[PDB]
């Protein structure tokens, strides 16, 4: 297994046709998962499944610039389940991050941070057993 929080360097940042794959298992009674694609201290793409926000399950996505959170994008389709193995795939495309979970399309997040080649770390955190984190060019 890997230790969470886990930092995956993205050398030279991200670029279209880069596919990032995260395999793990959600802990029992999970509260959260987070993927943070960082540009230095900024977070270009924060992907944050929340298992109990006012007793609903929701994925919150956002960008952090100069320590300020932007306008949240919220997706109520929620494919994760406490206790269960998952696969998150993040495919970088020209205008957005495209996310699939367990081989099903979940959401897209338009690029707010434009300097894709400076988005050079992925932080993976939260209530998971992390098995693998990697990337490949497709
Ligand atoms: C790092 C740490 O110690 N704590 C958290 C922080 C803090 O709990 C928080 O910033 C203190 O106010 O929160 C972090 O998660 C935030 C992040 O997911 C953003 C994305 O937009 O949302 C924040 O919650 C919002 C909430 O969605 C709104 O409905 C509400 O009106 O405002 C909330 C606070 O801004 C999350 O707290 C963070 O990265 O800041 C995660 C850290 O682990
Ligand atoms: Cl970085
Ligand atoms: Cl930018």
Swiss-Prot record:
One of its GO terms (biological process) is negative regulation of endocytosis. One of its GO terms (cellular component) is extracellular region. GO terms for molecular function: carbohydrate binding; chemoattractant activity; disaccharide binding; IgE binding; laminin binding; molecular condensate scaffold activity; protein phosphatase binding; protein phosphatase inhibitor activity. A major expression is found in the colonic epithelium. It is also abundant in the activated macrophages. Expressed in fetal membranes. Residues 6-136 form the Galectin domain. A beta-D-galactoside binds at residues 69-75. Signal peptide: none annotated. Transmembrane segments: none annotated. It is found in: Cytoplasm; Nucleus; Secreted. Probably forms homo- or heterodimers. Interacts with DMBT1. Interacts with CD6 and ALCAM. Forms a complex with the ITGA3, ITGB1 and CSPG4. Interacts with LGALS3BP, LYPD3, ZFTRAF1 and UACA. Interacts with TRIM16; this interaction mediates autophagy of damage endomembranes. Interacts with cargo receptor TMED10; the interaction mediates the translocation from the cytoplasm into the ERGIC (endoplasmic reticulum-Golgi intermediate compartment) and thereby secretion. Galactose-specific lectin which binds IgE. May mediate with the alpha-3, beta-1 integrin the stimulation by CSPG4 of endothelial cells migration. Together with DMBT1, required for terminal differentiation of columnar epithelial cells during early embryogenesis. In the nucleus: acts as a pre-mRNA splicing factor. Involved in acute inflammatory responses including neutrophil activation and adhesion, chemoattraction of monocytes macrophages, opsonization of apoptotic neutrophils, and activation of mast cells. This is Galectin-3. It comes from Homo sapiens. The gene is LGALS3.
